[PDB]
Design an enzyme around this catalytic site. Structure first.
Site, mmCIF file in Angstrom:
data_model
loop_
_atom_site.group_PDB
_atom_site.id
_atom_site.type_symbol
_atom_site.label_atom_id
_atom_site.label_comp_id
_atom_site.label_asym_id
_atom_site.label_seq_id
_atom_site.Cartn_x
_atom_site.Cartn_y
_atom_site.Cartn_z
ATOM 1 N N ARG A 47 9.860 -2.023 -7.725
ATOM 2 C CA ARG A 47 10.072 -0.716 -6.707
ATOM 3 C C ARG A 47 11.745 -0.689 -6.563
ATOM 4 O O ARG A 47 11.976 0.264 -5.941
ATOM 5 C CB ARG A 47 9.635 -1.184 -5.266
ATOM 6 C CG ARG A 47 10.208 -2.221 -4.639
ATOM 7 C CD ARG A 47 9.723 -2.134 -3.224
ATOM 8 N NE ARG A 47 8.288 -2.372 -2.951
ATOM 9 C CZ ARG A 47 7.960 -1.850 -2.037
ATOM 10 N NH1 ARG A 47 7.987 -0.848 -1.333
ATOM 11 N NH2 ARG A 47 6.395 -2.033 -2.118
ATOM 12 N N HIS A 62 2.624 4.054 1.510
ATOM 13 C CA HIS A 62 1.861 2.784 0.928
ATOM 14 C C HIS A 62 1.308 3.204 -0.558
ATOM 15 O O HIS A 62 1.076 4.122 -0.827
ATOM 16 C CB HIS A 62 0.788 2.496 1.973
ATOM 17 C CG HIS A 62 -0.477 1.871 1.137
ATOM 18 N ND1 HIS A 62 -0.462 0.590 0.913
ATOM 19 C CD2 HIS A 62 -1.710 2.243 0.695
ATOM 20 C CE1 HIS A 62 -1.438 -0.142 0.707
ATOM 21 N NE2 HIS A 62 -2.295 1.088 0.290
ATOM 22 N N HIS A 63 1.442 1.872 -1.503
ATOM 23 C CA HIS A 63 1.089 2.320 -2.670
ATOM 24 C C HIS A 63 -0.405 1.584 -2.733
ATOM 25 O O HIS A 63 -0.703 0.490 -2.306
ATOM 26 C CB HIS A 63 1.722 1.334 -3.551
ATOM 27 C CG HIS A 63 3.210 1.778 -3.756
ATOM 28 N ND1 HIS A 63 4.215 1.484 -3.179
ATOM 29 C CD2 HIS A 63 3.434 2.783 -4.928
ATOM 30 C CE1 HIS A 63 5.334 2.098 -3.620
ATOM 31 N NE2 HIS A 63 4.866 2.587 -4.594
ATOM 32 N N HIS A 66 -0.606 0.677 8.343
ATOM 33 C CA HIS A 66 -0.178 0.173 7.124
ATOM 34 C C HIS A 66 -0.485 -1.428 7.241
ATOM 35 O O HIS A 66 -0.847 -2.019 6.229
ATOM 36 C CB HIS A 66 1.419 0.474 7.115
ATOM 37 C CG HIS A 66 1.866 0.455 5.596
ATOM 38 N ND1 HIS A 66 3.069 0.259 5.369
ATOM 39 C CD2 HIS A 66 1.213 0.039 4.410
ATOM 40 C CE1 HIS A 66 3.284 0.291 3.929
ATOM 41 N NE2 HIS A 66 1.881 0.098 3.372
ATOM 42 N N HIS A 108 -2.683 -4.038 5.009
ATOM 43 C CA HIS A 108 -2.235 -5.284 4.357
ATOM 44 C C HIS A 108 -2.748 -6.503 4.967
ATOM 45 O O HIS A 108 -2.015 -7.580 4.772
ATOM 46 C CB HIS A 108 -0.460 -5.240 4.169
ATOM 47 C CG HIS A 108 -0.075 -4.232 3.344
ATOM 48 N ND1 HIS A 108 -0.261 -4.352 1.804
ATOM 49 C CD2 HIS A 108 0.451 -3.044 3.307
ATOM 50 C CE1 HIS A 108 0.403 -3.337 1.237
ATOM 51 N NE2 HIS A 108 0.726 -2.519 2.010
#
Ligand SMILES: [Zn+2]
Ligand SMILES: [Zn+2]
Lengths: 131, 131
Positions: free
Chosen positions: B2, B99-100, B124, B128
């Site tokens: 990233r 968010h990926h 988010h 996770h």
């Protein structure tokens, strides 16, 4: 919550001679019931404090400590988590980590040893889907 | 990574006048097809750079920008993410996040707009599992 004091609770589970053998899969390795016997009912300043104390007890346990190298035992003797194999590290994260099965953000117990497990950095990151 | 340059790809998805409506559930809101039309094939130095330009593009789109308050448009105009309602924030994370779906750690596209979505901080963190 993670940084606020609390008391340790939990039974943990009996472990064999290859405790961290499954630290790289599923939820990893449980808190040994012997370690939980030593930490139970004890007060900690923060999870980090528990973390430190957790590894110290591991270095003090005759059966558990023998499953590590001298270098890793020396680390645990001062509250530092044992280093993993290169294959299981991720950047600055090079030692076994403690994971909360039920997230503290979701009411999970910060010092509940039945909600704590030992995992490699690599596996921990996959558990948190990339973080 | 990233933090390494790359080109944005992906088609995104059509949206209505309630784009960030489901930002607090499931995978949140997709990248607007209209925004992807503008960013596709462009180069970015890092995901952070993408993030800034992504919000900038939003402020430039009349249909999307009109869905936010003046204060939030002001933020996107300079590449900052719009603030969420108080119930959706978490500590210092008080603005919508990207968010990926498939994590970069798992070979997920860093700039694949079909692998990116907009979510509230609270959501988010839940995605996770705690962080
Ligand atoms: Zn964890
Ligand atoms: Zn994410």
């Amino acid at each position: 919550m993670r940084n606020k004091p609390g008391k340790a609770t939990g039974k943990g589970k009996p472990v064999n001679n290859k405790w961290l053998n499954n630290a790289g899969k599923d939820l990893g390795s449980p808190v040994p019931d012997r370690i939980a016997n030593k930490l139970r009912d004890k007060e900690f300043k923060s999870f980090d404090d528990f973390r430190k104390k957790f590894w110290e007890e591991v270095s003090k346990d005759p059966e558990l400590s023998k499953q590590f190298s001298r270098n890793n035992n020396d680390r645990m003797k001062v509250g530092k988590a044992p280093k993993t194999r290169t294959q299981d590290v991720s950047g600055k994260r090079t030692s076994f980590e403690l994971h909360h099965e039920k997230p503290i953000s979701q009411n999970g117990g910060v010092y509940d040893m039945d909600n704590i497990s030992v995992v490699t950095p690599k596996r921990h990151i996959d558990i948190h889907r990339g973080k």
